[PDB]
Design a protein around this nucleic acid. Structure first.
Lengths: 106, 189, 135, 197, 171
RNA sequence: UUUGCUCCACACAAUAUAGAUGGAUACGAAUAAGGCGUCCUUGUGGCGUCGCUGAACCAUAGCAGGCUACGAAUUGCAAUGUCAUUUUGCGUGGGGAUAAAUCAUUUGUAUACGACUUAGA
RNA sequence: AGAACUGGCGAUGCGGGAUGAACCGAACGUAGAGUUAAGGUGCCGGAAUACACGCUCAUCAGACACCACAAAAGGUGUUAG
RNA sequence: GGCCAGCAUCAGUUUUGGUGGCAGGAUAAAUCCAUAGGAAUGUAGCUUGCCUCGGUAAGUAUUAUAGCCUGUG
């Protein structure tokens, strides 16, 4: 009763990058509980939302959402990549996104 | 090469109890008690008998198995101290000026005071350790007898005298004075 | 005199006949027994009843259980199985609190949502009695 | 998973803790290190003291109130170690270090709370037994920290007040265990044990 | 590497003057047939007048171990080139297989002498049969009766970074 | 000149979030050692048990969650489908409180100018 | 200071070597996806506080070749022979 | 009537897993099964100071009231 959620919380770590160069088209997500690329392969295709606030109420809400998905994995510790419609703003480094289960294969 | 097992034995006499827990050794006997903290050496004591104790080190390297024999010798000294005691004898030596030695009780603990060390005026004072019992000879008049259980304190308080009664800015081949250890025996034996 | 109190530690020391639990590898969770000793860091094992092959493994992939039994140095697979069946090791192991917790983890992982719901309602009833009892 | 993470820094290694932190507090976790005076650092005391003196040697010549500010307390030593692992010249790093709070001893808000342990920084697990290590309290006190004799007078007090709490809670625990053991044979529980519970 | 043992037969190329030359055999340790065939022509070209071009390889066969589930004392006679001079050595190992003994010999040689694979020639590997010819203590200390020992200081691995109880090293 | 100010109750209007929407669940010390239970001859005691990960423990069903102690459909196959948390203004009504600083003048323990130190109903 | 062969810079950006005209990799239309090079994976910093056998405790350790310095002579300090 | 999404069936490029069949090698080696021989980090058994049914020991003994190794098949 106290809980109603159907998502898994994860963190927007950073962009895809080399040393001294970044690709904002691609973002890195740390999902909770995940520790390997296997057992992260479950979360591929799954949708992601970054939920934030804004002061200008549009379509009847102050909260706004940026949607995306999980594309593939990252190396050896359960990190993944994501690609949103409109890439994320880089002030979200260390911010909670929420991964859904909407395209399912269970 | 890292070894597999290296052990030593300790022969406990009668009436001596050796309580050990977390490498804090505690030997009680007729004369007194003695405690020691060996929490800097990785060692296992295992009792086999009331008559002797086994100490062991695994995987070695000629460092741990080097300190193992040291631990053995320490515990043996601890055990023979509470039974036979320790008795150190230090003799006076002067060419010209008699070294007047006495014992005093200052505001704090007891001290041992010496005077006329080569015609000086400085009053050299040394603090007796907390365990020793210090006396002056009676069959002769130029001998001081330290005694106790802890050799580690008795020899140290003996060496303090020999250090303060040193010669400075003169030649030591010639100038042979002070207090010098003659004998390091036990009380009973 | 008074008993000289000497206690430091009592280990699961490695030796022949000791039973081990493998934690990493193809045969993890499956039991085995030590036959003899290769070196300081590694050994060889043989678990016939568990389906383990005769191996030669480091001591990082294993865990040393308390229980053990007696077999000769360098024994073969058929001998190990005999002595294992004799000393009844797979019942002495299952009776431990260790193994009960292992099976509990496996069960709790193998559960489905309906059983997870059953457990919630079964625990409600249990704490109901307990909290009517402790007041 | 917790919103805030309280870390007992006793028997912990400095850099090995600070890296873990500096990653977690950049990923967005609010972290509170506590009891930093009992931290440990490898190598012998004289060696670490030589290194700290080499650090003290470095001060801006033309005006020494511009240069490396040599903080002598352990909290600030660890803060230095973390800040070296963080890009503190940016908003990312500044925001990150605003998510950190380090203390000597264990103050009130964090004495009645739960403390955790980083096992990939623990001395007993990482260091070989027999190697010499160093304690940050003794070090700071050697280089000019004047409040070791105070946190000690406070920590024993905290400890007394905590041990009495444990002494009460342990009795409550045995009472609850003896009250719950009278229902374990019941069909509500031997039906649970078929599901592992 | 993950070594293997090979059996390489070779033959100087036939001619009308001698159309049945002498087959030379080598028992070589290596990771694959390619470098095995390379080392064969390295050692044979030290002893006899032949090369790859002036010769051929007849048969190349993997030698597997006969009793790989048996602990054995492998004595090893080897030579290695240092930064200043060339030397010989004898080492005893207590592994179950010839190839594993070699794999751990290359390693501790590289540790204790900083000698690489390109410097070492493995002359002889001998399974010692009896427990009386062993002369090295780091082996003899495992040939005792009722051998047992503990692992005092245990370190459990961790998949999570934060733990809520101090660990114990008890085994 | 209760036209002004403060805290409390709520009617709220507006703004900004370095980013929870089940629970930040409390002994201490050692780690080549300990915890827990129990018995006593209460000790560095005897016995028993445990660890090998918190993979736990607790809470958790109910119109975003109800009336009694029936309804929830047609948001039509998904689109945060909002409850958080500070600050700020306004009004309602309930009490509570009634001052200093600066300039200018002056002093010289001070002083480039500021500043400092003094005095003045 | 003066020559030979090749390659390059000059005329040349790009990833790496923190930084660098010349080194390593590799040579460029605008973009997307994938894979790699040389180099790297504690944190800064994207990536294993990965596995394995060993050595070392240094009172100015040591740590990506060109490269940014190091010899002769000694040590029962240790390891192996 | 168009723009933004979702799903399905397809195509191209690609990544990541599960799983079946077949071949080769010393027609894998080993394990396992039978047999010969042998030995010790020496098992029953036999002389053994007492002492826990030979606990201890130092000798004997080559499978016996444990087993091992080698070879052959």
């Amino acid at each position: 009763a106290e809980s109603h959620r159907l998502y898994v919380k994860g963190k927007h770590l950073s962009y895809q990058r080399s040393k001294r160069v970044n690709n904002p088209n691609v973002s890195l997500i740390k999902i909770e509980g995940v520790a390997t690329p296997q057992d992260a392969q479950f979360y591929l295709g799954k949708r992601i939302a970054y939920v934030y606030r804004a002061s200008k109420e549009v379509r009847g809400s102050k909260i706004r959402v940026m949607w995306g998905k999980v594309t593939r994995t990252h190396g050896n510790s359960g990190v993944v990549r994501a690609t949103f419609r409109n890439n994320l703003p880089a002030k979200t480094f260390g911010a909670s996104v929420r991964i859904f289960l909407y395209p399912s294969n269970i | 090469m890292k070894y597999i097992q290296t052990e030593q034995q300790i022969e406990v006499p009668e009436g001596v109890t050796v309580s050990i827990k977390s490498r804090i050794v505690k030997v009680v006997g007729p004369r007194g008690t003695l405690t020691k903290n060996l929490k800097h050496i990785d060692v296992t004591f295992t009792k086999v008998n009331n008559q002797l104790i086994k100490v062991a080190v695994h995987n070695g390297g000629r460092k741990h198995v080097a300190a193992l024999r040291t631990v053995k010798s320490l515990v043996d000294n601890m055990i023979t101290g509470v039974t036979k005691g320790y008795k150190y004898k230090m003799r006076y030596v002067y060419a010209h000026f008699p070294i007047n030695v006495n014992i005093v009780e200052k505001d704090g603990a007891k001290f041992i005071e010496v005077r006329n060390f080569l015609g000086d005026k400085k009053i050299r004072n040394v603090p007796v350790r907390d365990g020793v019992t210090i006396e002056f000879s009676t069959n002769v008049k130029d001998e001081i007898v330290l005694s106790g259980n802890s050799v580690e304190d008795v020899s140290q308080n003996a060496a303090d005298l020999q250090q303060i009664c040193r010669v400075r800015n003169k030649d030591i081949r010639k100038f042979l004075d002070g207090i010098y250890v003659s004998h390091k025996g036990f009380i009973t034996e | 005199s008074t008993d000289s109190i000497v206690k430091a530690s009592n280990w699961r020391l490695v030796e022949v006949g000791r039973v081990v639990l493998i934690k990493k590898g193809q045969s993890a969770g499956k039991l085995a027994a030590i036959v003899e000793i290769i070196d300081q860091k590694k050994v060889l094992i043989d678990g016939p009843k568990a389906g383990v092959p005769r191996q030669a493994i480091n001591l990082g992939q294993v865990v040393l259980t308390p229980l053990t039994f007696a077999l000769p140095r360098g024994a073969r697979t058929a001998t190990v199985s005999k002595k294992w069946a004799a000393a009844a090791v797979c019942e002495k192991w299952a009776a431990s609190s260790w193994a009960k917790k292992i099976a509990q983890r496996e069960r709790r992982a193998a559960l489905t949502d309906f059983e997870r719901f059953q457990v919630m309602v079964l625990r409600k009833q249990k704490r109901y009695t307990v909290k009517k009892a402790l007041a | 998973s917790q919103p805030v993470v309280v870390i007992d820094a006793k028997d912990h290694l400095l850099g090995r803790l600070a890296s873990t932190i500096a990653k977690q507090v950049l990923n967005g976790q609010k972290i509170v290190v506590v009891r930093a005076e009992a931290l440990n650092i490898s190598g012998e005391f004289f060696r670490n003291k030589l290194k700290y003196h080499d650090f003290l040697r470095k001060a801006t010549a033309f005006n020494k109130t511009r240069g490396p500010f040599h903080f002598r307390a352990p909290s600030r030593i660890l803060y230095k170690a973390i800040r070296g692992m963080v890009s503190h010249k940016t908003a990312r790093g500044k925001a990150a270090l605003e998510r950190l709070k380090i203390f000597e001893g264990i103050p009130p808000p964090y004495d009645k709370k739960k403390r955790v342990v980083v096992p990939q920084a623990l001395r007993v697990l990482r260091l070989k037994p027999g190697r010499k290590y160093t304690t940050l309290g003794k070090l700071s006190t050697s280089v000019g920290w004047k409040y070791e004799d105070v946190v000690a007078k406070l920590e024993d007090k905290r400890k007394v007040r905590s041990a009495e709490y444990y002494a009460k809670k342990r009795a409550f625990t045995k009472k609850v265990s003896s009250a719950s053991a009278a229902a374990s044979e019941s069909d509500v529980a031997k039906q649970l044990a078929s599901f592992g519970y | 590497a993950h070594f293997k043992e090979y059996q390489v037969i070779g033959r100087r190329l036939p001619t009308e003057s001698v159309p049945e030359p002498k087959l030379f055999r080598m028992r070589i340790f290596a990771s694959n047939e390619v470098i095995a065939k390379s080392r064969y022509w390295y050692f044979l070209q030290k002893l006899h007048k032949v090369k790859k071009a002036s010769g051929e390889i007849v048969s190349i066969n993997q030698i597997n171990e006969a009793h790989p589930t048996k602990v054995k004392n492998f004595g090893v006679w080897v030579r290695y080139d240092s930064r200043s001079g060339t030397h010989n050595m004898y080492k005893e190992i207590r592994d179950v297989s010839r190839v594993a003994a070699v794999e751990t010999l290359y390693q501790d040689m590289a540790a204790r002498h900083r000698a690489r694979f390109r410097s070492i020639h493995i002359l002889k590997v001998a399974e010692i049969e009896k427990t009386a010819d062993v002369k090295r203590q780091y082996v003899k200390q495992f040939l005792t009766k009722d051998l047992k020992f503990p692992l005092p200081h245990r370190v459990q691995k961790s998949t999570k970074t934060f733990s809520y109880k101090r660990p114990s090293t008890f085994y």
